[PDB]
Design a protein around this ligand. Structure first.
Ligand code: QK8
Ligand code: OLA
Ligand code: OLA
Ligand code: OLA
Ligand code: OLA
Ligand code: OLA
Ligand code: OLA
Ligand code: OLA
Ligand code: OLA
Ligand code: OLA
Ligand code: OLA
Ligand code: OLA
Length: 446
């Protein structure tokens, strides 16, 4: 290799390493330095940042020395240990994306029953096991394959995994580290998106009908409440209500909360109501029969009158599961419920009639930073790891088809995932972008 090429690769690969080290350090420090970022899902973001910091600092720079020198001059032990660090960190990154996806999946689908398991202690447990499973998966086969075969077939001046020499084995590892994780995460995301728009529609429906209060108030019974009828305490103390609010939110609210904190509290309530419906023998068959829109109209009724109240509408409930909506609408209107809240009752009854949201005027689903970040990091993994996995795919159908130059470039693209991951957080999350900016400006000063 020419000296002109040596300096150029060193500068470009060196700046890439610098951009990767900085970005993942900013991500780790942002979570450390900012309280608003100290959340359960960001424990996984920090864990992912640690894996990407190893890729940037170690893997990238060692790969550069290997390319520039044209051979491996550090010995077989140094080779096998460096391969172990590289594969274990790359797999720990994939396993961390799986932890982010699953946590986000359960927190949206099961907000009540999962956010009782969703502690920083359980995040740390899942993180450690992800790093341990990653090590136990790659490191023993990297170091001991030569001993099971009876020969080290990797030549001196060469560094690669011996068991990956056959393309089908490499394809097997690609199925387990790319194809299956990606299919699992895409399926998890489509469920997360569908649930989010479903839950947002129930929130906007009840916001119109019941009303949203961002400050502590008293309900009809005189108990302290917040949001869309979220009971804080039965205790006749405002400080007891404020303390129960801070325990539920995770911050010193002082009796005032945001719409998103009021939506999170409402989604636990939807889960509590849906648990009741499925446990009630009179509401369970009708709810199972109904579609997503009519399910929300039943939830609306439950939120207003209670479990037994809605169960009192025996003939309307029968007509709704028989798909005779015009008939069900007649019986629902001839009630004390319609007489008290005519505007709200008509809107609910129309929802049961049409099966649409026409009685209300709903906006498209507001994609929150969490959903957007998840989609961005998933697309970042698919984009940067696709070239290498296509190269693996074609190598199974054609022996030595893939040029050495292409393996080299596809490996570099895998590494680029570690560079673009902190960018996904900065583009999607305002709090990350401002903390990254704050930290960079603070470092520039002094
Ligand atoms: C999920 C497990 O991970 C993978 O399936 N991966 C797919 C792409 C290949 C990638 N690396 C790229 C650098 C290569 C290299 O020569 N590294 C040294 C300079 C010699 C030892 C250090 C080794 C292979 C690792 C990540
Ligand atoms: C050489 C060091 C580079 C490392 C920087 C850290 C990576 C994070 C930065 C990239 C994200 C870009 C931020 C711009 C936000 C624009 C928001 C938008 O319009 O959606
Ligand atoms: C956080 C993970 C650890 C980061 C440590 C980074 C060190 C790895 C970088 C590679 C360059 C150093 C390798 C020296 C090889 C040259 C010696 C020789 O010519 O034989
Ligand atoms: C209760 C399920 C057991 C979870 C054990 C997870 C093993 C560690 C590896 C991490 C990545 C694997 C996929 C993520 C599963 C997490 C699901 C959960 O939150 O329980
Ligand atoms: C993502 C999974 C792909 C990784 C492939 C590895 C599969 C696991 C099997 C490995 C068998 C080798 C274990 C090493 C045994 C050590 C023997 C000894 O004591 O010398
Ligand atoms: C995200 C979906 C992307 C679709 C994947 C299809 C595009 C393939 C990607 C390009 C890089 C692969 C390079 C293949 C080189 C092997 C051919 C050869 O023998 O020279
Ligand atoms: C990540 C930003 C870096 C900027 C992109 C430019 C660097 C990538 C390209 C350089 C590698 C060389 C590719 C051309 C093939 C040369 C063939 C050969 O080496 O035999
Ligand atoms: C300061 C660093 C300058 C940036 C590098 C320039 C990158 C431009 C993009 C195209 C890829 C260049 C690859 C060179 C091919 C030469 C082929 C060879 O002889 O190996
Ligand atoms: C021309 C297609 C572009 C493919 C993108 C590959 C990613 C490049 C990013 C990192 C820069 C590393 C410098 C290139 C190393 C030289 C390898 C070689 O061509 O022999
Ligand atoms: C609120 C604070 C956030 C704390 C989150 C802690 C998560 C744990 C992080 C991962 C550590 C994984 C181990 C990394 C190995 C590095 C070893 C090395 O330097 O080679
Ligand atoms: C986990 C802690 C790791 C500690 C770092 C150890 C660094 C490894 C040092 C180099 C030893 C190289 C082994 C020599 C094998 C020669 C084989 C050959 O050249 O074919
Ligand atoms: C025991 C289950 C009964 C269902 C609760 C509904 C009680 C009806 C009366 C009060 C209206 C309050 C406003 C709506 C929010 C209620 C939240 C909830 O308790 O799930």
């Amino acid at each position: 290799m020419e000296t002109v090429e040596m300096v150029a690769i060193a500068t470009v690969a060196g700046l890439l390493s610098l951009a990767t080290v900085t970005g993942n350090i900013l991500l780790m420090l942002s979570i450390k330095v900012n309280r608003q970022l100290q959340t359960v899902n960001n424990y996984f973001a920090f864990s992912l940042a640690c894996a990407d910091l190893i890729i940037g600092a170690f893997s990238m720079n060692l790969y550069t020395v290997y390319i520039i020198m044209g051979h491996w001059a550090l010995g077989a032990l140094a080779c096998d240990l460096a391969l172990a660090l590289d594969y274990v960190a790359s797999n720990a990154a994939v396993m961390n994306l799986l932890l982010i996806s699953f946590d986000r999946y359960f927190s949206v689908t099961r907000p009540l029953s999962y956010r009782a398991k969703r502690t920083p202690r359980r995040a740390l447990l899942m993180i450690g096991l992800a790093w341990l499973v990653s090590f136990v998966l790659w490191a023993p086969a990297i170091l001991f394959w030569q001993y099971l075969v009876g020969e080290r077939t990797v030549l001196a001046g060469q560094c690669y995994i011996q068991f990956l020499s056959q393309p089908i084995i490499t394809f097997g590892t690609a199925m387990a580290t790319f194809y299956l994780p990606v299919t699992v995460m895409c399926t998890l995301y489509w469920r997360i998106y569908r649930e989010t728009e479903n839950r947002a529609n129930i929130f906007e429906m009840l916001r119109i009908d019941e009303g949203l209060r961002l400050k502590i108030y008293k309900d009809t019974e005189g108990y302290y409440t917040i949001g869309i009828g979220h009971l804080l305490t039965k205790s006749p103390s405002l400080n007891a209500a404020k303390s129960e609010l801070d325990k539920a939110i995770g911050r010193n609210t002082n009796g005032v909360i945001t719409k998103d904190e009021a939506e999170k509290l409402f989604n636990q309530d939807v889960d509590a109501a849906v648990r009741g419906i499925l446990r009630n023998a009179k509401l369970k068959p009708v709810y199972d029969s109904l579609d997503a829109v009519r399910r929300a109209a039943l939830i609306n009724m439950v939120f207003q009158m209670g479990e037994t109240g809605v169960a009192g509408f025996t003939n309307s409930l029968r007509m709704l599961q028989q798909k005779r909506w015009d008939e069900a609408a007649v019986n629902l209107a001839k009630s004390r419920w319609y007489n008290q809240t005519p505007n709200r009752a008509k809107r609910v009854i129309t929802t049961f009639r049409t099966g649409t949201w026409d009685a209300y005027t709903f906006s498209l689903v507001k994609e929150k930073a969490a959903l957007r970040t998840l989609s961005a990091i998933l697309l970042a993994f698919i984009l940067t790891w696709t070239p290498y996995n296509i190269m693996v795919l074609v190598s199974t159908f054609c022996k030595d088809c893939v040029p050495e130059t292409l393996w080299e470039l596809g490996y570099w693209l895998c590494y680029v995932n570690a560079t673009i991951n902190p960018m996904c957080y900065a583009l999607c999350n305002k709090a990350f972008r401002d903390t990254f900016r704050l930290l960079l400006l603070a470092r520039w000063d002094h």
